[PDB]
Amino acid sequence: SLNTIDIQGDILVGMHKQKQLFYFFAINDPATFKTHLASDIAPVVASVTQLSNVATQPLVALNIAFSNTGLLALGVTDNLGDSLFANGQAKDATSFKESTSSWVPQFAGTGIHGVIILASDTTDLIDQQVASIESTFGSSISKLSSLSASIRPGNEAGHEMFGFLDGIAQPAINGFNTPLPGQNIVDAGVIITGATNDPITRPSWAVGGSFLAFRQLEQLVPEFNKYLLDNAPAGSGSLQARADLLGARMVGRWKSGAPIDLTPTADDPALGADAQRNNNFTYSHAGFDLGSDQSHCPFSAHIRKTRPRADLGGSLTPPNLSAGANSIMRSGIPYGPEVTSAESASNTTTQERGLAFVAYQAQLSQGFHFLQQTWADNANFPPGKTPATVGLDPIIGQNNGQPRVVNGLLPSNSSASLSIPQFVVSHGGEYFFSPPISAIGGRLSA
Ligand code: HEM
């Protein structure tokens, strides 16, 4: 049975606060760190149960996760069953056709021992909690770096920096979530280590945790906007409307959240807002060949690359349940300033903004790493298409800094190719393990 009282809340629910801080730390004097981990952190770690009840959301929601080197600093030599986690993300960078030479230097190594995720409706409240932690831990905790993040303002609340509504699609955990139309339904052990049908044996104290893949993904927003205007397909509407269509073709949803598979030529903001309808699709359409039809959604669209649905078989009618083991829970939040007047006018980025990307999964090789390397970065994925060369994911697809060839985006001609510069630039990140709450004051403090 899924013991949600013992699972950290960001994993299955998300913090859902206006402001978040990712506080990346090293451990000194581990015996002292441990005493404070047990006395000061464990009691204020927010659980799934706590966050699932709108009446027990804490003022400051706190989660904590440890890198491989952080667990080792705590004297934990156990095999958590994940080679990617053990090796650290810097060693995995070439899997994604990037180089750590481009990373924030603190990520390009294994000095980071963990991350504290703090979330609250104001930054003052976060800062007070950080000050309390630094006060009680003293020098046994050392801040290496941090990243502040926020829900975007006004009509962009819940949208990422390019302007698209985010956080729509997640796997439903069988026995825990009430599935929405079209939502994949997966065994708990796809996300939670040691939960139902996790095939990898874990240390006993690690049952109820998850691996957290963090990526600091800069977004080149003025450049993206200008690209869409410059490449907008011909049509009856305003130039901006035609540019908007191209952007929707790249993501697989309109900015409103409406999936293009269900509304391929025009936005439907009412559909985008409706969780009962906005995920209710499989990419299959009766009367169309799944292997060649890109009129509803390109084969290269971001969401189609990252959850293939009927492209990997299974039910043609919703819900499609394919590739459940390749599911990830996403808890990303935007970072950086909004686009400034001068950046928009010059079509040029000056300040860094983007997505503080967070993915949870029980097996890094099946989740984030797989989606990036085997799907998004693979010009021949999905398989069995005509033309066979789908191209790269236009949002996240990487090829060692080169422009990406992306096919199928133009509704007028599915064979038309575009060469697209990166609009998302990796600054690196790390793989962490978010332990069950019991382990925080338990094994990890022993
Ligand atoms: C700055 C970088 C990124 C941006 C701007 C971005 C944006 C989006 C947007 C707008 C959606 C549609 C909203 C939704 O369906 O919930 C989405 C969905 C999704 N993204 Fe990305 N994303 C980024 C990075 C990533 C990465 C690195 C991965 C994995 C390697 C990823 C995996 C997914 C998945 C699995 C979905 C849901 C697909 C589905 O279930 O249909 N995203 N993203």
Q: Find the structural class using helix and strand composition.
A: alpha+beta
Helix content class: 10-25%
The number of domains is: 1
Relative strand content: 15-25%
Largest sheet: 5 strands, antiparallel
Compute the number of strand runs. 13
Looking at the structure, what is the overall shape? globular
- The helix-strand sequence is HEHHEHHHEHEEEEHHHHEEHEHEEEH
Question: Could you tell me which ligands this complex binds, including any ions or cofactors?
Answer: protoporphyrin IX containing FE
Q: Could you give the distance between the termini?
A: 27 Å
Cα gyration radius (Å): 22 Å
Q: Helix tally?
A: 14
Active site: 166 (proton acceptor)
Enzyme class: oxidoreductase
InterPro entries: Dimeric_a/b-barrel, DyP_N, Dyp_perox_C, Dyp_peroxidase
EC number: 1.11.1.19, 1.11.1.7
Description:
The chain has 446 residues and is an alpha+beta fold. It has one domain. Helices cover 23% and strands 18% of the residues. The two termini are 27 Å apart. The PDB classes it as oxidoreductase. The entry lists the keywords decolorizing peroxidase (DYP), oxidoreductase, heme. The assembly is monomeric.
List keywords for this structure.
446 residues; 18% strand; four-stranded antiparallel sheet; binds protoporphyrin IX containing FE; 14 helices
Short description:
With 446 residues, the chain is of the alpha+beta class.
List the helices and strands and how they pair.
Blueprint: H1 9-12, E1 19-27, H2 30-41, H3 48-51, E2 60-66, H4 68-73, H5 83-87, H6 89-92, E3 114-120, H7 123-137, E4 141-150, E5 172-173, E6 185-186, E7 210-219, H8 221-230, H9 239-251, H10 269-273, H11 302-306, E8 329-330, E9 333-335, H12 341-346, E10 354-361, H13 368-376, E11 404-407, E12 417-420, E13 424-434, H14 437-441
Parallel strand pairs: 5-6
Antiparallel strand pairs: 1-3, 1-4, 2-3, 7-10, 7-13, 8-10, 9-10, 11-12
Helix pairs in contact: 8-9
PDB class: oxidoreductase
Keywords: decolorizing peroxidase (DYP), oxidoreductase, heme
Assembly: monomeric
